[PDB]
Amino acid sequence: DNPYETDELLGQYLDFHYGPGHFDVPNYPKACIEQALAHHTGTTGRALDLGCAVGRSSFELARRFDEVIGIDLSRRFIDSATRLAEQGQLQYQVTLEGELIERRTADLAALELSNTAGRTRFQVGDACALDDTLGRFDLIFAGNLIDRLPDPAAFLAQLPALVRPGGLLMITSPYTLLPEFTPRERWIGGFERNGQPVRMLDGLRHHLEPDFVLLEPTRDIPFVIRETTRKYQHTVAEASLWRRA
Ligand SMILES: Nc1ncnc2c1ncn2[C@@H]1O[C@H](CSCC[C@H](N)C(=O)O)[C@@H](O)[C@H]1O
Ligand SMILES: N[C@@H](Cc1[nH]cnc1[SeH])C(=O)O
């Protein structure tokens, strides 16, 4: 039932996280973490990467944080991230055209990520119901996650307790709201209420303030996902950075 446990998605996401770029758009997980690191003014002991997929943002965070925990619900994704952490490389297939496929390599050494791979730990888990043993963090990253969760409010309700005061929360999303992933009654934005628009960002503020303070302004970060030799997604996420009060 989970698309994120399929070979189709594995090949998209291993290319997206570790492959060459497309249309001269920079690697997206790396671009996201560059922005988080440019704004984090706290200590660098511990970061949490929620919805980490096959782990590029977690390895990027590990260049600066002593410990990085990456959590994703997809076991196929997490098994790839762990293999990269432990062996430094893996191979995968991408679609060329129809059934014609091509084998490719992901390599942490080539990306200058192998030296700190030991600072990562990857686990399967549900971001809407995180273990109560997880502790708290100096920095939390949730990339392209909130529009893929069935209970966004339940996810957000954990975050004040998960971030130390003075720490940083970074959420990015293109707000691709879909009933397949979020029941309409659980949307926190993307609709009209009492005849006025409620944007997803308004929903984020309602749930996070004043425990977090939004660093203004929000920023657009684009990304490209390769599906075949010829077909790509090209999308503009909104990044919002939040300081814990
Ligand atoms: N309940 C849940 N708990 C944890 N991860 C979840 C989840 N529902 C979906 N996900 C994960 O959220 C991700 C959405 S796509 C974004 C992946 C990655 N952060 C990137 O920016 O490229 C997928 O990896 C999916 O497996
Ligand atoms: N289309 C991709 C990228 C993404 N992630 C969250 N929203 C979007 Se659009 C996916 O569904 O994983």
Side-chain angles (χ1 to χ4, degrees), residues 2-29 31-63 65-111 113-114 116-185 187-195 197-215 217-218 220-245:
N2 190 1
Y4 293 113
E5 298 269 18
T6 66
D7 277 338
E8 180 182 14
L9 263 295
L10 188 60
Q12 282 174 24
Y13 265 86
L14 286 168
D15 175 85
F16 185 48
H17 276 222
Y18 303 107
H22 311 284
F23 303 113
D24 299 317
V25 178
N27 180 269
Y28 176 65
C32 288
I33 295 319
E34 287 176 347
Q35 283 295 325
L37 291 178
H39 292 89
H40 181 55
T41 59
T43 47
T44 54
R46 216 170 172 234
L48 181 63
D49 185 355
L50 292 178
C52 64
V54 293
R56 179 66 179 269
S57 44
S58 299
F59 291 121
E60 295 285 343
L61 279 166
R63 303 181 63 76
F65 283 85
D66 302 332
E67 179 178 44
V68 179
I69 308 298
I71 299 173
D72 203 273
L73 193 69
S74 170
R75 184 157 300 274
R76 204 174 215 57
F77 281 178
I78 290 296
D79 284 340
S80 276
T82 304
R83 176 176 282 278
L84 274 164
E86 294 174 353
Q87 312 279 342
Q89 65 159 17
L90 59 72
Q91 295 186 14
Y92 61 101
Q93 309 278 355
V94 297
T95 292
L96 299 178
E97 175 188 299
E99 288 171 1
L100 299 173
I101 60 176
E102 176 181 288
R103 205 172 70 255
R104 304 231 182 142
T105 297
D107 190 288
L108 297 190
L111 298 165
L113 294 170
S114 39
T116 46
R119 316 212 264 186
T120 76
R121 166 177 110 231
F122 292 101
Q123 40 193 84
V124 178
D126 179 2
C128 295
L130 294 164
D131 290 344
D132 68 3
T133 56
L134 205 49
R136 49 192 216 161
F137 296 87
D138 296 296
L139 188 145
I140 297 188
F141 177 63
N144 279 9
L145 179 63
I146 197 86
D147 58 335
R148 294 294 177 256
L149 293 180
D151 199 345
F155 160 78
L156 295 172
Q158 310 167 109
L159 300 177
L162 284 173
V163 185
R164 312 177 83 81
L168 183 73
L169 163 68
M170 176 180 189
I171 288 162
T172 72
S173 181
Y175 309 133
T176 305
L177 302 179
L178 296 168
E180 334 167 14
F181 292 108
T182 315
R184 169 64 184 72
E185 52 264 36
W187 290 11
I188 57 161
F191 54 75
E192 268 197 5
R193 190 195 286 136
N194 314 316
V198 180
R199 293 292 201 145
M200 279 293 277
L201 183 60
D202 298 319
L204 289 175
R205 287 180 172 247
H206 166 76
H207 286 274
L208 293 176
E209 297 176 341
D211 298 69
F212 289 91
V213 176
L214 178 64
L215 306 178
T218 58
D220 283 348
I221 308 184
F223 68 87
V224 175
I225 299 179
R226 177 202 186 284
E227 301 188 352
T228 71
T229 290
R230 298 182 169 282
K231 185 179 195 286
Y232 306 78
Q233 304 172 30
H234 190 173
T235 297
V236 185
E238 175 166 65
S240 53
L241 290 170
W242 309 79
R243 191 88 64 205
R244 184 69 170 90

